[PDB]
Amino acid sequence: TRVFKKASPNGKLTVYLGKRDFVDHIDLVDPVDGVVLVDPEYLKERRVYVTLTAAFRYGREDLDVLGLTFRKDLFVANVQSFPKKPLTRLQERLIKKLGEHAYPFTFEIPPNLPSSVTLQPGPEDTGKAIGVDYEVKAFVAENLEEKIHKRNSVRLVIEKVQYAPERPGPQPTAETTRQLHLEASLDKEIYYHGEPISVNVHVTNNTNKTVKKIKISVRQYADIVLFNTAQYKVPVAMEEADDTVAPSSTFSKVYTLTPFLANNREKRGLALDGKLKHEDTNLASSTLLREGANREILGIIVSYKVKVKLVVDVAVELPFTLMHPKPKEEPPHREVPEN
Amino acid sequence: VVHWVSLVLYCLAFVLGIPGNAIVIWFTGFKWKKTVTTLWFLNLAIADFIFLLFLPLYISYVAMNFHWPFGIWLCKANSFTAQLNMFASVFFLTVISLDHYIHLIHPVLSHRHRTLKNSLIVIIFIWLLASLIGGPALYFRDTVEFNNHTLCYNNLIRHHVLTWVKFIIGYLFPLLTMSICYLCLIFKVKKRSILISSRHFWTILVVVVAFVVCWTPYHLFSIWELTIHHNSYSHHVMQAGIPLSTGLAFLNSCLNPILYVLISKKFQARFRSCTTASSSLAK
Amino acid sequence: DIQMTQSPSSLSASVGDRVTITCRASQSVSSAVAWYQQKPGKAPKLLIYSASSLYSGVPSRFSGSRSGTDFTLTISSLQPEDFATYYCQQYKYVPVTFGQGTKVEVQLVESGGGLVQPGGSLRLSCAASGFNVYSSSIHWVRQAPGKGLEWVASISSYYGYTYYADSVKGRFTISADTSKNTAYLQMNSLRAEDTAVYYCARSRQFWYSGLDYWGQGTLVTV
Amino acid sequence: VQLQESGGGLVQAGGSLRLSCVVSGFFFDTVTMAWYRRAPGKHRELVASATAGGTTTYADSVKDRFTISRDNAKNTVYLQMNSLKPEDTAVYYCNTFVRSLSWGQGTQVTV
Amino acid sequence: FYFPGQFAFS
């Protein structure tokens, strides 16, 4: 009930999709079902094609200075619907309701593709965002290469996301002895968006030097890899405390932090969740991948770590995941009480 | 011998440059938002403006007897203006090349020139440096009525060092950085892990070849004139011709507009000049 | 804006009857409709949070459906603990609107109230426990005596956004303190028709699904 | 986006209504503008196709019972009916065959 | 040898 349809500006070639969301499982993703509808005319001398592109828009001001389109494609698929596997339950309902001129199309995304993650349009940076943008492009063509116009096509956009696993992960911990014995831990590995993060800072100094200030920092690693690997640091929450521990003594505290977008609207390099239009979403969900490192895994990979530092500077880093739970009904993918 | 060809090249460059320079300045300064690359393009367009302002005067200067019939006219001002324009254009070309070499591996922050204040201070520094190099005109230039015609002519090691420094600024700065950045990115030389599109490849090659064929002949002719000077003579070597180098210079200054900005996004916008819903489904 | 209507204003039935409560929206909103049941003198309780999805906890006999803009709620059998007032509410746009009410025949504690007279000022505290301020959204909804629910103001701490109704813009301010985990509503220029019972409602910030938890009541008389 | 539907009324049996649909906006040009009907409590279903050229495809219960005409000059489409059964009671909507326009409030036809 | 001078826009 309540399928999503997008109609091209001319009165023909609309596209029906069951849901504008496709969870990315570790092994196999959900196939991109849907039915492209076309009027009886306008096709007798052509055929319909559906093309899915995993774009990598990464250019500011969306201007091609020297032919730099920035339109790097990570995966492209083609299907002919008006010349396979049996149709799922949803596709049969669309065929029955729409009529006999309801040509189905089905996609099968391979594993270890990056999820839909964008970067925050901070100062300047006018135009579109910087990140992976999946899209479904339905058009009529008979050569696979003839230039098609945006008017005679549907540029429906989809988003591929990943949700937190049911089984909680192992509790993270780290230590560092070099100058001072340090021990840190988190409450639980699985963290939902907006939930507080509690850390343990139980420490036992031994050196004559005494700590002056303590800082707990959370940063969001944007491991963007298109031509070379990157390990960008962008802080997302900070906690500076004046607490001090005397030499040959111990200090334990339960300082808590909470990452949110209210105070990070000006920072650059921050990665947000997948966006379909100019609305604002939350921080980018942590992306998890299977073993073997997936070779290079070209795309944007978001990982979260929390660190504790001493100012006198031994520091430790504790990874964790920041992911949404499995939704009950459906994500509307927009500010529900908008405007 | 080739004076007719040079005049034809002058006319073609002017005709293809005035509208091309006009369209880019208005489009960038009115429609598109101010970005560092857009400011580079607009500054290059302004350099083309003032560069071609004296081009109609250059028509009369390249007219009969390849001389300056406008008398004195304080032509120090417009000669310095033209040389300042050419220096500013080549400096904007090389800074665009450097910014493009920074453009690859885009997500990095690099030297943090994305701020508008840094772009404006760099532009004004470039203008001041080009005015410093383009400053000295009355120091050497004079005018005489020789062979029953007056000319704007320049006036022994001072001329040698002046031409040497002008050539080294016009070659080491633009051309060496173009070969370091453009050439050692397109031919897999130097770190070539960055893939390049076919359109990107072709347009970089066109930029490089146009720059070469338009500016290398002029610098080479200047160096040859400096070398053959102070020895032999001038009327035997017959250097009364060769305005083709300056014609190619004007061709480059009018071709860079259409090549740089009049592509991709601009092409579709100039040619030109639904909401997603839901539907029923029975259970 | 959107003006929300319910055709039956008073319904009378007996135990063991299938009744239909209909609701029509002025504009074509999506499935974003919530249904609330208010016992007399008690805070309303959410029943259906998407016009088709049953809230966790309510009996399975309650059901809802949509057709164009004809959101309806049906009860298979009226148990004796069902005679109350039902409100039809949409949350697709910032001025959320409630129905006129159909008569059938984690804790939040506020603090405040008392006679203030016109021109005064009160600060209503909403001591919220059990949920994080950043992971939830706080709304303030008042109920004039004998009338339907009305929306006043809301805050979303995660996004740093505040929304106010057109009738309380400027005069009313909303704030929330994270460390104390409370929501404060300070009112200025209290006029004649602000006499109402004020409820501090909390909804889930990420993917709003109706006002999950309500307050108790700190009625203010001017 | 105008979607002006008119020509509704109450008829005992076997009476034409002559519905009309007028749309303001993009011209019809070369698109197939169709007609849909929705019985009370049921879903929409196709009635007639009315392509740019003259080819009309009806339904199982509509074939040899209904007629359709299009007027391009006024950007409007009409339906002509005969021998209307009591089952015909439904709300008639007009929309492109591809279902690209917004579903406006149609007219009520009761038999 | 009367080249002293120039005939360009330099």
Tab-separated table of N, CA and C in Angstrom, chain C residues 6-118:
chain	number	residue	atom	x	y	z
C	6	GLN	N	-13.936	16.056	12.146
C	6	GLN	CA	-14.494	14.743	12.443
C	6	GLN	C	-16.005	14.836	12.299
C	7	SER	N	-16.577	13.991	11.442
C	7	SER	CA	-18.012	14.077	11.173
C	7	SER	C	-18.874	13.801	12.400
C	8	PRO	N	-18.692	12.697	13.154
C	8	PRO	CA	-19.560	12.481	14.318
C	8	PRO	C	-19.042	13.182	15.563
C	9	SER	N	-19.802	14.150	16.073
C	9	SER	CA	-19.401	14.866	17.276
C	9	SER	C	-19.802	14.141	18.551
C	10	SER	N	-20.891	13.377	18.515
C	10	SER	CA	-21.340	12.598	19.662
C	10	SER	C	-21.866	11.264	19.159
C	11	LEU	N	-21.308	10.176	19.676
C	11	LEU	CA	-21.691	8.828	19.287
C	11	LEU	C	-22.128	8.050	20.519
C	12	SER	N	-23.223	7.307	20.382
C	12	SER	CA	-23.767	6.487	21.455
C	12	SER	C	-23.883	5.051	20.969
C	13	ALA	N	-23.397	4.112	21.777
C	13	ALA	CA	-23.395	2.706	21.405
C	13	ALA	C	-23.439	1.860	22.670
C	14	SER	N	-23.455	0.545	22.481
C	14	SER	CA	-23.508	-0.417	23.570
C	14	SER	C	-22.320	-1.366	23.478
C	15	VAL	N	-22.102	-2.114	24.559
C	15	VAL	CA	-20.993	-3.057	24.613
C	15	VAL	C	-21.232	-4.178	23.611
C	16	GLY	N	-20.218	-4.471	22.801
C	16	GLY	CA	-20.333	-5.498	21.784
C	16	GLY	C	-20.852	-4.959	20.467
C	17	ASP	N	-20.344	-3.799	20.061
C	17	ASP	CA	-20.785	-3.126	18.849
C	17	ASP	C	-19.560	-2.672	18.069
C	18	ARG	N	-19.619	-2.804	16.747
C	18	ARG	CA	-18.558	-2.326	15.868
C	18	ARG	C	-18.926	-0.928	15.386
C	19	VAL	N	-18.201	0.078	15.866
C	19	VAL	CA	-18.472	1.465	15.520
C	19	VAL	C	-17.320	2.008	14.685
C	20	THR	N	-17.631	3.024	13.886
C	20	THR	CA	-16.674	3.643	12.981
C	20	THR	C	-16.573	5.128	13.295
C	21	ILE	N	-15.352	5.595	13.538
C	21	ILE	CA	-15.072	7.002	13.790
C	21	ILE	C	-14.338	7.530	12.567
C	22	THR	N	-14.979	8.426	11.826
C	22	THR	CA	-14.427	8.925	10.578
C	22	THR	C	-13.745	10.272	10.790
C	23	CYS	N	-12.801	10.576	9.904
C	23	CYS	CA	-11.992	11.782	10.001
C	23	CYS	C	-11.546	12.189	8.606
C	24	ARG	N	-11.757	13.454	8.258
C	24	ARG	CA	-11.415	13.975	6.942
C	24	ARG	C	-10.499	15.179	7.094
C	25	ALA	N	-9.398	15.177	6.352
C	25	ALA	CA	-8.435	16.265	6.395
C	25	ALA	C	-8.711	17.265	5.281
C	26	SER	N	-8.466	18.543	5.579
C	26	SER	CA	-8.683	19.588	4.584
C	26	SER	C	-7.760	19.414	3.387
C	27	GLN	N	-6.496	19.096	3.633
C	27	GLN	CA	-5.503	18.926	2.585
C	27	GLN	C	-5.136	17.453	2.453
C	28	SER	N	-4.419	17.135	1.376
C	28	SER	CA	-4.044	15.753	1.072
C	28	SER	C	-2.719	15.431	1.756
C	29	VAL	N	-2.812	15.085	3.038
C	29	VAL	CA	-1.638	14.636	3.774
C	29	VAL	C	-1.388	13.159	3.487
C	30	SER	N	-0.180	12.708	3.817
C	30	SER	CA	0.184	11.308	3.649
C	30	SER	C	-0.374	10.481	4.796
C	31	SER	N	0.126	9.264	4.959
C	31	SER	CA	-0.326	8.372	6.021
C	31	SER	C	0.032	8.869	7.411
C	32	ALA	N	0.588	10.074	7.537
C	32	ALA	CA	1.004	10.627	8.823
C	32	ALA	C	-0.221	11.155	9.565
C	33	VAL	N	-0.942	10.233	10.199
C	33	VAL	CA	-2.082	10.563	11.048
C	33	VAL	C	-2.009	9.716	12.310
C	34	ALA	N	-2.237	10.351	13.456
C	34	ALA	CA	-2.237	9.686	14.747
C	34	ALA	C	-3.595	9.854	15.414
C	35	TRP	N	-3.998	8.838	16.170
C	35	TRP	CA	-5.289	8.818	16.844
C	35	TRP	C	-5.069	8.736	18.346
C	36	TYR	N	-5.702	9.639	19.088
C	36	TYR	CA	-5.521	9.736	20.529
C	36	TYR	C	-6.844	9.505	21.242
C	37	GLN	N	-6.780	8.814	22.375
C	37	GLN	CA	-7.932	8.578	23.235
C	37	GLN	C	-7.698	9.291	24.557
C	38	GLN	N	-8.617	10.178	24.927
C	38	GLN	CA	-8.492	10.969	26.146
C	38	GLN	C	-9.630	10.618	27.090
C	39	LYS	N	-9.302	9.953	28.193
C	39	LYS	CA	-10.262	9.812	29.271
C	39	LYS	C	-10.514	11.179	29.906
C	40	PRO	N	-11.715	11.413	30.433
C	40	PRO	CA	-12.006	12.724	31.033
C	40	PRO	C	-11.138	12.973	32.256
C	41	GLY	N	-10.366	14.055	32.205
C	41	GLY	CA	-9.459	14.398	33.278
C	41	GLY	C	-8.102	13.732	33.225
C	42	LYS	N	-7.782	13.028	32.142
C	42	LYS	CA	-6.504	12.349	32.003
C	42	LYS	C	-5.849	12.756	30.690
C	43	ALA	N	-4.530	12.608	30.643
C	43	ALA	CA	-3.788	12.957	29.442
C	43	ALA	C	-4.120	11.984	28.314
C	44	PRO	N	-4.170	12.455	27.070
C	44	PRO	CA	-4.494	11.563	25.953
C	44	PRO	C	-3.428	10.500	25.748
C	45	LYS	N	-3.860	9.365	25.204
C	45	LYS	CA	-2.996	8.221	24.953
C	45	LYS	C	-2.982	7.915	23.463
C	46	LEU	N	-1.789	7.712	22.913
C	46	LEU	CA	-1.658	7.366	21.505
C	46	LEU	C	-2.188	5.961	21.245
C	47	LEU	N	-2.927	5.808	20.146
C	47	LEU	CA	-3.482	4.521	19.743
C	47	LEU	C	-2.869	4.015	18.443
C	48	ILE	N	-2.921	4.814	17.381
C	48	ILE	CA	-2.370	4.455	16.081
C	48	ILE	C	-1.445	5.580	15.646
C	49	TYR	N	-0.233	5.234	15.215
C	49	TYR	CA	0.775	6.243	14.930
C	49	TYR	C	1.073	6.421	13.448
C	50	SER	N	0.414	5.677	12.557
C	50	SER	CA	0.615	5.910	11.132
C	50	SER	C	-0.667	5.699	10.332
C	51	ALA	N	-1.827	5.764	10.988
C	51	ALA	CA	-3.149	5.592	10.390
C	51	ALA	C	-3.389	4.141	9.995
C	52	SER	N	-2.349	3.313	10.073
C	52	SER	CA	-2.490	1.877	9.858
C	52	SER	C	-1.677	1.024	10.817
C	53	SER	N	-0.707	1.583	11.534
C	53	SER	CA	0.190	0.812	12.382
C	53	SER	C	-0.285	0.900	13.824
C	54	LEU	N	-0.547	-0.253	14.427
C	54	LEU	CA	-1.020	-0.302	15.800
C	54	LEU	C	0.135	-0.028	16.754
C	55	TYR	N	-0.076	0.891	17.691
C	55	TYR	CA	0.942	1.184	18.687
C	55	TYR	C	1.137	-0.009	19.613
C	56	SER	N	2.364	-0.169	20.102
C	56	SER	CA	2.677	-1.294	20.972
C	56	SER	C	2.058	-1.074	22.348
C	57	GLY	N	1.132	-1.950	22.725
C	57	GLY	CA	0.499	-1.863	24.026
C	57	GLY	C	-1.015	-1.822	23.974
C	58	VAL	N	-1.566	-1.144	22.972
C	58	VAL	CA	-3.014	-1.016	22.830
C	58	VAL	C	-3.579	-2.332	22.304
C	59	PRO	N	-4.841	-2.655	22.593
C	59	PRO	CA	-5.398	-3.933	22.135
C	59	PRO	C	-5.482	-4.005	20.618
C	60	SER	N	-5.403	-5.233	20.100
C	60	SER	CA	-5.434	-5.465	18.661
C	60	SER	C	-6.800	-5.194	18.042
C	61	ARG	N	-7.841	-5.017	18.857
C	61	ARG	CA	-9.167	-4.738	18.319
C	61	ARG	C	-9.227	-3.381	17.629
C	62	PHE	N	-8.450	-2.410	18.100
C	62	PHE	CA	-8.366	-1.126	17.418
C	62	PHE	C	-7.691	-1.292	16.063
C	63	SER	N	-8.223	-0.605	15.056
C	63	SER	CA	-7.657	-0.666	13.717
C	63	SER	C	-7.965	0.629	12.985
C	64	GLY	N	-7.126	0.949	12.003
C	64	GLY	CA	-7.303	2.157	11.226
C	64	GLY	C	-6.977	1.912	9.767
C	65	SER	N	-7.478	2.812	8.925
C	65	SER	CA	-7.270	2.704	7.489
C	65	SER	C	-7.374	4.090	6.872
C	66	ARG	N	-6.874	4.204	5.646
C	66	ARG	CA	-6.879	5.460	4.913
C	66	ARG	C	-7.387	5.231	3.498
C	67	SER	N	-8.007	6.269	2.940
C	67	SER	CA	-8.461	6.245	1.551
C	67	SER	C	-8.624	7.692	1.107
C	68	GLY	N	-7.783	8.131	0.174
C	68	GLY	CA	-7.727	9.540	-0.164
C	68	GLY	C	-7.377	10.349	1.066
C	69	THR	N	-8.328	11.143	1.563
C	69	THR	CA	-8.245	11.719	2.906
C	69	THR	C	-9.535	11.336	3.634
C	70	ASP	N	-9.572	10.102	4.130
C	70	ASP	CA	-10.719	9.585	4.867
C	70	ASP	C	-10.257	8.696	6.011
C	71	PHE	N	-9.244	9.141	6.752
C	71	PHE	CA	-8.705	8.334	7.838
C	71	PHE	C	-9.802	7.978	8.831
C	72	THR	N	-9.892	6.695	9.170
C	72	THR	CA	-10.961	6.201	10.021
C	72	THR	C	-10.396	5.223	11.040
C	73	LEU	N	-11.086	5.118	12.172
C	73	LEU	CA	-10.711	4.215	13.249
C	73	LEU	C	-11.941	3.428	13.669
C	74	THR	N	-11.812	2.105	13.710
C	74	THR	CA	-12.922	1.217	14.024
C	74	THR	C	-12.571	0.354	15.226
C	75	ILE	N	-13.556	0.135	16.091
C	75	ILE	CA	-13.416	-0.728	17.257
C	75	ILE	C	-14.327	-1.929	17.050
C	76	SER	N	-13.751	-3.131	17.126
C	76	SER	CA	-14.538	-4.340	16.904
C	76	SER	C	-15.627	-4.494	17.958
C	77	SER	N	-15.292	-4.256	19.223
C	77	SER	CA	-16.254	-4.364	20.312
C	77	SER	C	-15.913	-3.325	21.368
C	78	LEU	N	-16.924	-2.601	21.839
C	78	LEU	CA	-16.721	-1.550	22.834
C	78	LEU	C	-16.724	-2.166	24.226
C	79	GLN	N	-15.535	-2.361	24.786
C	79	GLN	CA	-15.416	-2.740	26.180
C	79	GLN	C	-15.842	-1.569	27.065
C	80	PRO	N	-16.259	-1.836	28.305
C	80	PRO	CA	-16.713	-0.731	29.166
C	80	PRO	C	-15.640	0.304	29.451
C	81	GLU	N	-14.365	-0.060	29.361
C	81	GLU	CA	-13.270	0.897	29.513
C	81	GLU	C	-12.854	1.485	28.168
C	82	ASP	N	-13.824	2.043	27.441
C	82	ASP	CA	-13.568	2.644	26.141
C	82	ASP	C	-14.311	3.947	25.903
C	83	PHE	N	-15.251	4.318	26.767
C	83	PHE	CA	-16.049	5.526	26.578
C	83	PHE	C	-15.179	6.734	26.893
C	84	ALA	N	-14.700	7.402	25.850
C	84	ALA	CA	-13.814	8.548	25.997
C	84	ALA	C	-13.941	9.412	24.748
C	85	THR	N	-13.034	10.373	24.602
C	85	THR	CA	-13.018	11.284	23.466
C	85	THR	C	-11.832	10.949	22.573
C	86	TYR	N	-12.078	10.853	21.270
C	86	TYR	CA	-11.063	10.461	20.302
C	86	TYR	C	-10.711	11.641	19.408
C	87	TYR	N	-9.413	11.895	19.249
C	87	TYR	CA	-8.909	13.010	18.461
C	87	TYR	C	-8.118	12.497	17.268
C	88	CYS	N	-8.284	13.171	16.137
C	88	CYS	CA	-7.636	12.817	14.881
C	88	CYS	C	-6.613	13.899	14.559
C	89	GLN	N	-5.337	13.525	14.531
C	89	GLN	CA	-4.243	14.484	14.479
C	89	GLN	C	-3.293	14.146	13.341
C	90	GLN	N	-2.835	15.175	12.634
C	90	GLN	CA	-1.877	15.028	11.549
C	90	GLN	C	-0.579	15.732	11.913
C	91	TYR	N	0.543	15.183	11.449
C	91	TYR	CA	1.841	15.755	11.784
C	91	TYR	C	2.726	15.903	10.554
C	92	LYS	N	2.135	16.190	9.395
C	92	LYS	CA	2.939	16.404	8.199
C	92	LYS	C	3.505	17.817	8.119
C	93	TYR	N	2.923	18.775	8.834
C	93	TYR	CA	3.358	20.162	8.760
C	93	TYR	C	3.465	20.746	10.163
C	94	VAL	N	4.280	21.800	10.284
C	94	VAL	CA	4.605	22.345	11.605
C	94	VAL	C	3.368	22.737	12.404
C	95	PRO	N	2.368	23.428	11.839
C	95	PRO	CA	1.147	23.671	12.617
C	95	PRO	C	0.302	22.414	12.729
C	96	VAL	N	0.730	21.465	13.567
C	96	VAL	CA	-0.022	20.230	13.723
C	96	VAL	C	-1.392	20.551	14.298
C	97	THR	N	-2.407	19.853	13.803
C	97	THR	CA	-3.787	20.156	14.140
C	97	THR	C	-4.485	18.904	14.641
C	98	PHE	N	-5.296	19.074	15.677
C	98	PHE	CA	-6.054	17.990	16.277
C	98	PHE	C	-7.517	18.110	15.873
C	99	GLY	N	-8.239	17.003	16.003
C	99	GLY	CA	-9.651	17.006	15.697
C	99	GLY	C	-10.473	17.675	16.780
C	100	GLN	N	-11.746	17.911	16.459
C	100	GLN	CA	-12.661	18.484	17.436
C	100	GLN	C	-13.069	17.490	18.512
C	101	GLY	N	-12.721	16.215	18.360
C	101	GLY	CA	-13.023	15.227	19.373
C	101	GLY	C	-14.354	14.541	19.159
C	102	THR	N	-14.368	13.216	19.277
C	102	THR	CA	-15.580	12.423	19.130
C	102	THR	C	-15.884	11.763	20.466
C	103	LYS	N	-17.026	12.109	21.053
C	103	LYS	CA	-17.412	11.547	22.339
C	103	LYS	C	-18.084	10.197	22.138
C	104	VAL	N	-17.674	9.211	22.929
C	104	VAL	CA	-18.238	7.868	22.881
C	104	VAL	C	-18.886	7.587	24.228
C	105	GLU	N	-20.173	7.257	24.208
C	105	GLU	CA	-20.910	6.979	25.435
C	105	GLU	C	-21.758	5.720	25.293
C	106	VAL	N	9.250	5.607	32.077
C	106	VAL	CA	9.304	6.962	31.541
C	106	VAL	C	8.078	7.752	31.979
C	107	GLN	N	8.305	8.797	32.771
C	107	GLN	CA	7.237	9.640	33.284
C	107	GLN	C	7.606	11.102	33.085
C	108	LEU	N	6.590	11.924	32.835
C	108	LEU	CA	6.756	13.366	32.692
C	108	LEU	C	5.858	14.058	33.705
C	109	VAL	N	6.455	14.897	34.549
C	109	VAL	CA	5.743	15.612	35.601
C	109	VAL	C	6.021	17.098	35.439
C	110	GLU	N	4.959	17.894	35.356
C	110	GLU	CA	5.089	19.337	35.238
C	110	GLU	C	4.969	20.002	36.605
C	111	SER	N	5.173	21.319	36.612
C	111	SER	CA	5.076	22.111	37.830
C	111	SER	C	4.716	23.540	37.459
C	112	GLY	N	3.732	24.096	38.146
C	112	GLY	CA	3.301	25.456	37.902
C	112	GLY	C	1.807	25.584	38.126
C	113	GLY	N	1.247	26.652	37.579
C	113	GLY	CA	-0.174	26.918	37.664
C	113	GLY	C	-0.484	28.057	38.619
C	114	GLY	N	-1.770	28.190	38.921
C	114	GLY	CA	-2.245	29.217	39.823
C	114	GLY	C	-2.666	30.484	39.099
C	115	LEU	N	-3.498	31.269	39.782
C	115	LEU	CA	-3.978	32.526	39.225
C	115	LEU	C	-2.815	33.486	39.006
C	116	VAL	N	-2.794	34.129	37.840
C	116	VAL	CA	-1.697	35.023	37.489
C	116	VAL	C	-2.230	36.394	37.090
C	117	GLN	N	-3.474	36.437	36.594
C	117	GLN	CA	-4.122	37.630	36.052
C	117	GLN	C	-3.427	38.075	34.767
C	118	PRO	N	-4.133	38.760	33.866
C	118	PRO	CA	-3.516	39.158	32.593
C	118	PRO	C	-2.284	40.026	32.801
